[PDB]
Amino acid sequence: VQLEPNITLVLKHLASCGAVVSAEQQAALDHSIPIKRIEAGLRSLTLWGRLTTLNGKDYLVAEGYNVASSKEGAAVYETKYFYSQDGARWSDLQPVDSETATRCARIKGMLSGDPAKNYELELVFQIPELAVLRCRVDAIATATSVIPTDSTILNAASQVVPNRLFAGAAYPEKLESYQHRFSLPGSGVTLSQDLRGTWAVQYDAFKGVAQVRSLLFPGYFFYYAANELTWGSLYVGDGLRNNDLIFML
Amino acid sequence: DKVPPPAWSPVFASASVTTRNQVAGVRSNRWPGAVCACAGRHFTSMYVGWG
Amino acid sequence: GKNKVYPLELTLEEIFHGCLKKVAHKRKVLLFSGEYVEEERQLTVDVKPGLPTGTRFVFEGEGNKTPKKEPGPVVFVLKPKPHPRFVRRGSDLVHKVTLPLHHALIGTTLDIRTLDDRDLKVPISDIMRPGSSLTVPGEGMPLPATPSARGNLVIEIDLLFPTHLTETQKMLLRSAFFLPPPTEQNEETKKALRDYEAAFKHDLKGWATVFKR
Amino acid sequence: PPNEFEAENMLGAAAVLDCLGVGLGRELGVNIALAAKRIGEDPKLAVRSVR
Amino acid sequence: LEKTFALIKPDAVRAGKAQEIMQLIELNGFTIIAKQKLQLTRARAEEFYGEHKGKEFFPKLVNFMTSGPIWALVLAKPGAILAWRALMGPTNVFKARAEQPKCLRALYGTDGTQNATHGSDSPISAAREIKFFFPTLSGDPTIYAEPTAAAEYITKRIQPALAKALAALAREKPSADKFEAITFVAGYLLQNNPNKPKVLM
Molecular function (GO) terms listed (chain C) (predicted)? Predict the structure, then answer.
């Protein structure tokens, strides 16, 4: 039914889970999301998340794509990520090559504010902080991008497009009603096929709203309201990974 | 990094340092989700999150 | 076997998108008259997206016609007009931006308007070295072989050092360039730094944000 | 430097107005507070008071 | 059901009245087959205004038409050409205001040359211009599909290059399979042809 999640509805439904942004930053977002959506050629630019930092200048990260195709048995989106400290002026996040993509996953810690920070590894490897930020965003998006099943569909020329006749998911408390965004529409892959204890679902059946929380990445929340058929997802907190899931559960 | 992070980090309410009436608080790095806020004579502490 | 070679000037936008030019030719046919007689032919030349500079388009059978020899072909050699922003270097563009020193050290975001009608804001990811550069992948000219992939935009950085500095500014710079690591600082050092930061960012009598006269 | 002027606590005013249920709403209130700062800060447009 | 060409000039686009013009066009029964916003260059406009070659008003006409972006539209209706001439009204704005006050020239035009719209005159000119701005828009399956005209078309343009290609293929005689010969003849046609040049790098 919906074609792009709102920022206001998402920030309203996920407020209870701590997924909130400052009010001045909220107004700046309201003004400066369309500006970036028009400056860049994108046609769907939403807010992805907000990563914390050693300063107060958290990283607000937005994501936008033009084309979304079906390549090699996977729905692939040519995503582009932007970051900002305040909601006013956005900058871009260039992708990182594989050598850095492997040398950036060993840098556990909380990111600092200035995006001109260099971490050191071992000879010494000097890595920029924006590379680490992009690595963390890519990992979280690979592990957590959640949408209701059958919300997308395949057309001619093999483009994944919103299912304009989507009638919602029956049993919105079962994990079988949600799927990764990069699963092809025909495939029966859902969040159930992931590790059993990774995802937690709390479903308010009276107000008809379901919340899916990631336990492997503790700061990722997703909401799905069935009566109005609106689904959104945000990530608040840093992008570190919960390795010892077996002990916590 | 070879510098251990501090246990408390600042948090602001505006991107400009000239706004007239802005709250400004601190946030715990050890227990994530614990915040303290102060505006004039009205101050607060609150913890939201996983324990 | 003589041929007439003509420059063909194109703008970077045309080569990026793929133009379709109609050029005029003044061809001479020799007759019994003392002077020649000439005519204007129209030629349609179809430049493909991102053809390399120096491409030769040869029209066979077009050229001045002597009484005995069939005229040789006419050659058009592709060259680009100068651009205010970009200069192409093979398959990728080059942008030469003059950068302030504090933009180099502290870091800012360069603003670049691409050949396509999209703006671009690229952060400075570290302390930009003198004579260093930055690379934005997928933001160059298209590949002539494959009509999807492109090169990578290259920002060549030429720092713009300040012309004047006072002695107190030099004192502040030396204090910034020799500050001890944060795990080596005294409590007096931390208190002094906090006081100075609260004074420099003072909302009414501090100089952290000023309005240009 | 920014001009020194005399305004009220506009963010508090917006909070009060939203509490009572009248006025322009909180989001416009943040913008008004920042535009009034824009007006009052102007050295050329030297104002003693903005409201 | 016929269709005509019509362009909104830069004067009605600089004043932000393009959308209202489209709405009025649609309200009267037209159907916008295809639209495109585009800025002509000097050469393209001069080729566009070929009929008024060497006229007295040509300099200012070509200078105005390339001062800003315009809109190009194809409008479909049973009486599209005459209906668009009537709706578009008299060609002179000062005459238009007196004669027909509620017409596009009177409402949005300002000057003899800044009439704010341009339409076609006759079906031949309309088809020519639609082909000029929309090379891929189909149409006119009756005049083009005509045994005498089709034979003339093949003989005059396609036949001279094809005969040489089929001869070279008969000389070479490639593999008896279809695909190799088809690829060979297609490559030959795309390699040496009269109107296009040969590309070397």
Answer: protein-folding chaperone binding; unfolded protein binding
